[PDB]
Design a protein around this ligand. Structure first.
Ligand SMILES: CCCCC(=O)Nc1ccc(-c2ccc3ncn(CCC)c(=O)c3c2)cn1
Ligand SMILES: CCCCC(=O)Nc1ccc(-c2ccc3ncn(CCC)c(=O)c3c2)cn1
Lengths: 314, 291
């Protein structure tokens, strides 16, 4: 059943418009109540002998905790209308690498990742904790910015979408990619992964390449003290198995002929004495994983993580 | 409890439909499927709260392509239809046994109807639609512009939106429901009080026949469908630029009073189950008899 447009994205793009447009009529609550953290807005469409081109005739769309995620976007500095333009003005571009879908907004500021149903449950188990941490740090963090969480039902099949700020650059393309855990049971990018154009390298590949990150001592201090706070928050929640996403843009290799419009929140320029002029992009990914696993405590995972990351700097 | 969700949902559904319909190109020709089609939407929010709309409702539009085409053939743009119903709440009328709302514009009417009138509309929607294209929309019959079903707190109410037959600016002072064969206590006069009050309409020779020729055409379209028990709604405004009252006929030159008459057929679609062509025969001669 080849289609030119994927109905899963079309229904998602429809539902984001509908969600935000109805949200424009609902005044923001003065304080989020514990009921807002179990709330949801669903809507089910049933057209009969009335066909549309972009959307299927039978679909559902649900938004998880609208008031919570609306408040989160605000605290992260994103106007709801800017969120809408960025996701819907033009179709997002598809990216490969992750399990299911992984979309990038047309302005390359937002990311939309397909997650599982247990991931949706893990977010609810800690949305209140995550929100209270965004309040406390005023949104200045290395954790991902969870901006919206949605369920898209099409052809009697539910997909779960999660929107976030893009940790990479809206305009500077990433030339080298790592995912760093600091672990012992060592991590190499597979042969299958390594022959791609942009392979996600891991701890051992980082070391094998003599990779170092040159940012200068003040930025190093701010980044490590931030990383330390964020990790302690996860440790308190008994979380482990998270990663630092590290991207590297080669400056002299440049972008395409495309050279103020947006701020790359997770970017740090290289130090003035660096051997290479580059831009780094760093963020924690795959948080929200509890220690309970059916065959390392969160405190030990963290200490090892922080010590590894501390030494990637030079 | 009475501060109203039925109106609040209905107006939410109309904006939602006209927004959806702006993204579906209007067809040039209709299919038999379009006369059995429908668009249904169900909202269910959980610990989410909004002012106007309740937490749970349904909105169903009947044959969206047909009525959209009928609004086109009646000279109504969809956006002007949307502004008309929703930009300010419709004022209600206490013509009871169901709700009866008039747009802020006074250009359109929203009448609550039964589940069998919905069945009656579907049995003849195509017959009605093709009569409209042949007369190029120049009829005394009502202009059915849209038909929806709203569900709130597990009760289904059916809404039919028609063009307003009365004026959008000039109020009606006398109102008749003319049939042929008296009213118990603007009141709705029945037929005897036309006579008793020596009421007569003066509209001019040339315009009287154009109305009567179309009345014969319209009625002759109903009798071919075994329709009876229709009425001629006659509104009357003693004369003591934005829109048009297309059922208004101006004061005749040299009349006792210079006035404006609003006349068009209502409560059609009642099928025989006194004969249709007899019922015709009596009504037509009755209404032909005012000069
Ligand atoms: C419901 C709980 C979910 C658990 C959970 O924390 N997952 C999680 C968290 C964050 C990300 C993420 C965010 C931004 C990103 N920007 C760029 N790139 C680079 C693209 C090549 C990313 O990969 C990226 C990945 C992915 N997954
Ligand atoms: C689906 C229903 C089948 C039966 C059926 O044809 N009903 C039916 C048909 C037409 C009307 C109608 C139309 C326009 C009108 N304009 C003004 N005013 C004046 C308001 C004071 C009206 O009353 C009016 C009433 C009412 N009912």
């Amino acid at each position: 059943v080849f289609r030119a447009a994927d109905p899963l994205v079309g229904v998602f793009l429809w539902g984001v418009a509908h969600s935000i447009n109805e949200l424009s009529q609902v005044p923001p609550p003065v304080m989020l109540l514990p009921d807002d953290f179990k709330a949801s807005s669903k809507i089910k469409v049933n057209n009969h002998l009335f066909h549309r081109e972009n959307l299927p005739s039978h679909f559902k769309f649900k938004e998880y905790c609208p008031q919570v995620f609306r408040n989160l976007r605000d605290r992260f500095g994103i106007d709801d209308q800017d969120y809408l333009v960025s996701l819907t003005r033009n179709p997002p571009s598809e990216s490969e690498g992750s399990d299911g879908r992984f979309l990038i907004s047309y302005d390359r500021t937002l990311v939309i990742k397909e997650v599982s149903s247990e991931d949706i449950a893990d977010m609810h188990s800690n949305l209140s904790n995550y929100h209270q941490y965004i309040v406390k740090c005023h949104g200045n963090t290395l954790l991902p910015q969870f901006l919206g969480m949605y369920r898209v039902s099409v052809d009697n099949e539910d997909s779960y979408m999660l929107v976030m700020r893009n940790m990479f650059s809206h305009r500077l393309p990433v030339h080298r990619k790592y995912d760093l855990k600091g672990s012992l049971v060592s991590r190499e990018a597979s042969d299958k992964e390594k022959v791609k154009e942009l392979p996600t390298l891991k701890d051992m590949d980082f070391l094998n390449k003599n990779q170092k990150v040159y940012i200068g001592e003040e930025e190093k201090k701010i980044f490590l003290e931030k990383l330390k706070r964020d990790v302690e928050f996860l440790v308190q929640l008994k979380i482990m198995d998270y990663s630092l996403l590290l991207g590297i843009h080669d400056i002299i290799r440049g972008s395409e002929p495309e050279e103020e419009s947006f701020i790359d929140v997770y970017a740090i320029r290289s130090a003035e004495g660096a051997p290479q002029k580059e831009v780094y992009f760093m963020g924690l990914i795959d948080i929200l994983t509890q220690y309970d696993a059916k065959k390392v405590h969160p405190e030990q995972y963290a200490k090892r993580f922080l010590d590894f990351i501390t030494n990637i700097f030079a």
